[PDB]
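Summary for the steering committee. The consortium agreed at its last meeting that each partner would contribute one worked example illustrating the joint modelling workflow. Our contribution is presented below. We chose a case with several input lines so that the handling of multiple components could be demonstrated. No manual editing was applied between input and output; the record is shown as generated.
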Amino acid sequence: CTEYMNAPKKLPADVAEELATTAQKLVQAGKGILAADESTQTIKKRFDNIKLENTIENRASYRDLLFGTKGLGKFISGAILFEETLFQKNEAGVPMVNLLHNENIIPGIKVDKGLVNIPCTDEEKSTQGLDGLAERCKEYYKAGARFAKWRTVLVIDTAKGKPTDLSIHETAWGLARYASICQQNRLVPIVEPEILADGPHSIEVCAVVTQKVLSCVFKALQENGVLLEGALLKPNMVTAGYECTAKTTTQDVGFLTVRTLRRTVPPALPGVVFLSGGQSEEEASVNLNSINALGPHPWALTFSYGRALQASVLNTWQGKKENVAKAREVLLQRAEANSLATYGKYKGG
Amino acid sequence: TEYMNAPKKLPADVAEELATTAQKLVQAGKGILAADESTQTIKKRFDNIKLENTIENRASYRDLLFGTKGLGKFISGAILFEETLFQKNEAGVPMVNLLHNENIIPGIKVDKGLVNIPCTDEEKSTQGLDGLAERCKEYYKAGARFAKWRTVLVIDTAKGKPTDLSIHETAWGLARYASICQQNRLVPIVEPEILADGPHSIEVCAVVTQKVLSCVFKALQENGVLLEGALLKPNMVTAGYECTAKTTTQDVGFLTVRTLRRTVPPALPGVVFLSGGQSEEEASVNLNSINALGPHPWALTFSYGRALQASVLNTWQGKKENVAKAREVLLQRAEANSLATYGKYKGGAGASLYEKKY
Amino acid sequence: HCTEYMNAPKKLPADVAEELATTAQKLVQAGKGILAADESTQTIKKRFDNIKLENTIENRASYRDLLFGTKGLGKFISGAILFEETLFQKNEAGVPMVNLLHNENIIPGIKVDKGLVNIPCTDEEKSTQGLDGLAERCKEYYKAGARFAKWRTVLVIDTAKGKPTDLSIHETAWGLARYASICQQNRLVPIVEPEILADGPHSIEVCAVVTQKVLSCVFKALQENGVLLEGALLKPNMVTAGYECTAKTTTQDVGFLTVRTLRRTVPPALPGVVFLSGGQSEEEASVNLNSINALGPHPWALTFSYGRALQASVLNTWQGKKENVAKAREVLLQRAEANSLATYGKYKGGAGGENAGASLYEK
Amino acid sequence: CTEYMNAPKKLPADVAEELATTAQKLVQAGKGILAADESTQTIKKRFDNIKLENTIENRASYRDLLFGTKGLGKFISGAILFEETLFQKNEAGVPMVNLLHNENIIPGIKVDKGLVNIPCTDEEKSTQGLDGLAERCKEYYKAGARFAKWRTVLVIDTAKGKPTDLSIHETAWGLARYASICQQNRLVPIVEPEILADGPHSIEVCAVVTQKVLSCVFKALQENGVLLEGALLKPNMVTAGYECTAKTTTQDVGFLTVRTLRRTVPPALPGVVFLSGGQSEEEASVNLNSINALGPHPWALTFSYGRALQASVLNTWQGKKENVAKAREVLLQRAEANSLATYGKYKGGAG
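What follows is the complete predicted structure of the assembly.
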């Protein structure tokens, strides 16, 4: 008869079930996510890193290059798209989404509207996007998108008490509100509280901060009634700071990352999809491999890489359309490299 | 360095301006005029006076309100919808200048309305944080010196409403809004309206309002909001609309003052009450009852719209003929509530029947 | 000092963290669980009256000797929770009771809470006492041989009165968190026990909702107080319908909704969950624990911390008699093994599987 | 007609009313509280500075000296006692509490059981005493006690992040629990979250930490259902740290203290009763005066002083039965000095 009222109420069976199946498919054994959700601005920085200007024709051709790759769906379960790309066609008539449906890859969509400063903090970041989010999700689901992405940024600066409480909770609560809005509108939310590697902090300090942040994130999720079974976490790997602290090894990066997750992420969460940050394409693969070499986990420990999958793909494409067959060969190589890291079976040489 | 885990302070310059504006907004004997009705909301008002909801009529009506000579004596500020803040009257003069001429501070509604919180039974979240900082910069240039953001909570005891999710979404939303405002030089009116809907007793409303406000002010300190440059716009503590045990104004006054004294710190310059579904007389009589209870640690004044405008429209009918007669009615109500600020409004129980002898 | 992140709990010394973790692992060993023998003088007097026997120090010592003196009991039991008296007690022939456990390889534990009191401004909701002098008692209990502790808190589900209230949930959450961090500092693995009572007519789904909310809150308090999950254990109620509800709930639901709730709230750094049998029968406690483990392999050990569910029938077949000791120790081993098999999801002894079934006509 | 369930329930009208009257009396106009709640542990040290043996006879004689002062009730509304003193009689057969009743002073009782380390913090302190507290209160009320005191300690060290969140909440939640138990058992709780002045931090930093701590303390109080009308706060004044050697004049001590309270303490709280910390007898009076010279406040801003009232009373006594009269004059002098500080009218200026 009477429910315990002071508790978030359940997702209707139908959507809860769909969210859970999408989430499981997204972390299928041997697969991960391709981050191709670069906005017009963030594409202009990478395109013009290898020359040839940032037009709608070049962007469409580049996303065609990525999503048109045969066999990529064996290593990639989902592709995070920017709004433009989601409704876009190739120079050939076909929806970009259909080429993901061809290769049997799930389309996703970035839904955050970027970062703004939290007042009364030293430039700590709040993520925008809740305004009209529900309505955008309905439109994105119709367009084919089955999962979402929302990025928030925290900073480790121990001297200045960063990340601060205000920063941690603005981030935690923002993600929780986003994630519940997606699930209501039939999209699996990728919850991304990226702690930046910037600074000279040790790996132990990063472990402490990441644990504190994640504990607080999951608390907000529960608060807001988010179904963990139909959600994914996209955290930073636990590493020493860029400015260094006895330049640690992959053995450590793997242990302190697995430990942190085991103390903070409940097993109802189907999987964690790691973000590469500033790591090299190779170290992103070596570190993911070190994480999975530490035995079979309660969740799928896989990847959501952008730069780590695309860097040498761009630099071996250079715009010219003769390289598409050749550029996709570099993509597949990296996709398989990270697929093997999922299994803990990626060595090197 | 200093203690790092606490919000940083506002610059001495803006903190001082916010504090001055907040004080002026709750000046002795003054309150705020809520003329912030959107196009959709003001359309429903013009139906009652069978008038076309056009840009011409809206401009003429706001001209009617802000063009009133002597309105500034009783009104310190006017909340506006975006359109009106940039709008002109039919004779070319910008309506913000009409407020300036009567020395009334212009304000601006910045929330983008309500949406459902998922996993709650239709409990409401207020939208508007996206691009808010930018809108504030634009509104300050336009002349606006304070803002308004409305959130709605509901009391339904059997259904555990307001639920915790509801209270904190509201609390945190208002805290973020207030902090973004103050950064951009606007005094935020923090409005956590608990609806009077339902049959709940006045004691239950007191319990809920106290819990909500305790939670709101926590979010406020959390986000680093300067209480000295902010204002609270709460519901008066009242029994619900369908409560058989019908209460009188003296209780509305007591349980409202109590609730505020247990939750609102005195750094807050003043509370500007919302009318709710109260009639014009009730809104004045109840505000008067609140202030009849001694002098308070903060200014207990009003932010009324319907309670100031209801009869003004009904003695106008859109006709330029009856403008003079509508101003009459606005100044009457404005003065009535100005007197209730002091606790000296009668406006029509010993009342002894005497006789004889010495 | 060095510029590390300062607004978080500081780590335990490497030495004690490691000991706590090994004890916690041993406490949830394969095929093992915990024996709750921590009955107070007042509570043990109630059970001795059901066998028409007197409650003296001699009888209590004899009964605990009966339990801990059982040969081979350590194959099914990893640890035994004791009441302070028993921890510092010798048997008939002057042998310390803790030594009886050492022989049988069982780890001794100790109840450290000082009972329940009402939270003011709630409708008789309960707060657990005991933080005063706790650190000191732990030092004394560790010297006495105790390697883990137990602290019980009680929440009630009454949906109409909004129980458990937020005040109740946090007093319990914070109390347990404080208790945990005091124990771990003093080298004792804390069993964190937020028992949600089965009392009332609530459905299983409502219990799942409340258990999930409570555990989410408990683990938040743990993390804030700096408790090492690797060196701690959780002792929750199984998720079940209220006692006064309808007249059913199938054990497969008790199993599903219990496993689900834990998967959404308990992070895998926690070595194991040790369930309390509450008001279940001895057989039901075994059948339900079996249903939980029949649901594939789990990220933690899902085992038992049973008292009544292990002792009810032993007390019965004993009645204070020196002769029945031999015979009663068989009933103990029977139940201990029954639950050991339930740990593996491999218990039957009464029915088997609630499926298939019938009369096969063969051809 | 059901009430809103997820909120702490009210105290019975009877006890709520009594708590509120006691709280009001405790911060009467021109009055404050005498902290005579020293343990045997701590009064030993004060007796050592006056070369006196710490015996039951001497302790009883000293408390007789304090509470036996004629016309002390004019300047003091309440006296916080140590358990021993509450049940003790003078070398004469007269109950100590009867001496308080004679001057119409309200007896109070210290109920905390001292401090212990919070594990996983750098020696930050948690206050003990919740075990059996309800029962002790019933006993203390029967003995005549009408209000209680519970001391918690936070430290400001900005480099080490103190007070850390764990420390702030353990303190806040402990005080809330203590407060709620007292009120249930008819005792007005003095909520004391002392932020120590130790360190070289500036007055602004102290204001920032005190504000944060008090915001969190009052949050716990609402959570636990504490009736603010029947409670008192005993905070540190906002001051610079002991080191640094900045100015930190009394006008600033007054301003930043008043500001902090106005941003954190709701007016339902009848009054704030300041602790002196390690301030000198005069400094404690001058600073309290500077606070009240900043105009009439929404609550009574008064004192709960021990050392700052007793230091010279003790030293000008030396344990000697002759010096009783003489020391009592020093006490009244100080009591009146701080009573005048209440009104903002102590030593009619210096600027």
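Chain B has twelve helices and ten strands. The domain at 1-358 of chain B is CATH 3.20.20.70 (TIM Barrel).
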